[PDB]
Design a protein around this motif. Structure first.
Motif, PDB file in Angstrom:
ATOM      1  N   UNK A  90     -21.782   3.152 -60.408  1.00 21.60           N
ATOM      2  CA  UNK A  90     -20.751   2.430 -59.770  1.00 21.60           C
ATOM      3  C   UNK A  90     -20.266   1.540 -61.050  1.00 21.60           C
ATOM      4  N   UNK A  91     -21.476   0.966 -61.611  1.00 19.95           N
ATOM      5  CA  UNK A  91     -21.393   0.051 -62.474  1.00 19.95           C
ATOM      6  C   UNK A  91     -20.894   0.665 -64.145  1.00 19.95           C
ATOM      7  N   UNK A  92     -21.091   1.809 -64.296  1.00 16.93           N
ATOM      8  CA  UNK A  92     -20.664   2.427 -65.575  1.00 16.93           C
ATOM      9  C   UNK A  92     -19.285   3.022 -65.561  1.00 16.93           C
ATOM     10  N   UNK A  93     -18.922   3.597 -64.383  1.00 11.04           N
ATOM     11  CA  UNK A  93     -17.637   3.993 -64.232  1.00 11.04           C
ATOM     12  C   UNK A  93     -16.999   3.408 -63.058  1.00 11.04           C
ATOM     13  N   UNK A  94     -16.624   2.255 -62.876  1.00  4.55           N
ATOM     14  CA  UNK A  94     -16.270   1.569 -61.737  1.00  4.55           C
ATOM     15  C   UNK A  94     -14.723   2.075 -61.527  1.00  4.55           C
ATOM     16  N   UNK A  95     -14.471   2.104 -60.056  1.00  4.48           N
ATOM     17  CA  UNK A  95     -12.849   2.275 -59.641  1.00  4.48           C
ATOM     18  C   UNK A  95     -12.169   1.225 -60.018  1.00  4.48           C
ATOM     19  N   UNK A  96     -11.081   1.220 -60.336  1.00  6.52           N
ATOM     20  CA  UNK A  96     -10.152  -0.192 -60.429  1.00  6.52           C
ATOM     21  C   UNK A  96     -10.239  -0.777 -59.271  1.00  6.52           C
ATOM     22  N   UNK A  97     -10.451  -2.187 -59.368  1.00  7.15           N
ATOM     23  CA  UNK A  97     -10.478  -3.080 -58.406  1.00  7.15           C
ATOM     24  C   UNK A  97     -11.671  -2.954 -57.445  1.00  7.15           C
ATOM     25  N   UNK A  98     -12.622  -2.300 -57.572  1.00  8.26           N
ATOM     26  CA  UNK A  98     -13.758  -2.009 -56.903  1.00  8.26           C
ATOM     27  C   UNK A  98     -14.945  -2.570 -57.327  1.00  8.26           C
TER      28      UNK A  98
END
Length: 150
Positions: A16-24
């Motif tokens: 979740x940290x290395x490739x986080x979804x925009x706004x999350x």
């Protein structure tokens, strides 16, 4: 030490940290890997734009076979969200798959905001309003958006 759910939850955290979804954004309490909190921004160019919504994800020792208990901490007004903050969402109740990770869960909830399923009236007032006069719905969405800022 590392339990199977714990081991999973740690992988879910890093991804979740290395490739986080925009706004999350999301994270567990340094004191409990099983209780998480997250924030979702109302996406851009939607009546949800600018909102900062809080959420709590509670996991069990049987994750990922059993999905997390997700709920909104900030007040909402949406056809698929109950009065207590719980979410009538597909992949979280009847269509959960151990493949889905935390990031995939949040992504789906964000997408759900601006694309409600009228055939799953968790909030009946919001459901009617969404389909009858979008003008009153947008006004009401704007409200939970303004009060989420406080």
């Amino acid at each position: 030490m590392s339990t199977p759910a714990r081991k999973r939850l740690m992988r879910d955290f890093k991804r979740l940290q290395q490739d986080p979804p925009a706004g999350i954004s999301g994270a567990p309490q340094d004191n409990n890997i099983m209780l998480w909190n997250a924030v979702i921004f109302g996406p851009d160019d939607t009546p949800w734009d600018g909102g900062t919504f809080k959420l709590s994800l509670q996991f069990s020792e049987d994750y990922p076979n059993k999905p997390p208990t997700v709920r909104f901490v900030s007040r909402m007004f949406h056809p698929n969200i109950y009065a207590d903050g719980s979410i009538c969402l597909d992949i979280l109740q009847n269509q959960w798959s151990p493949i889905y990770d935390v990031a995939a869960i949040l992504t789906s909830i964000q997408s759900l905001l601006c694309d409600p399923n009228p055939n799953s009236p968790a909030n009946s007032e919001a459901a009617r309003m969404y389909s009858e006069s979008k003008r009153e719905y947008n006004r009401r969405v704007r409200d939970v958006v303004e009060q989420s800022w406080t």
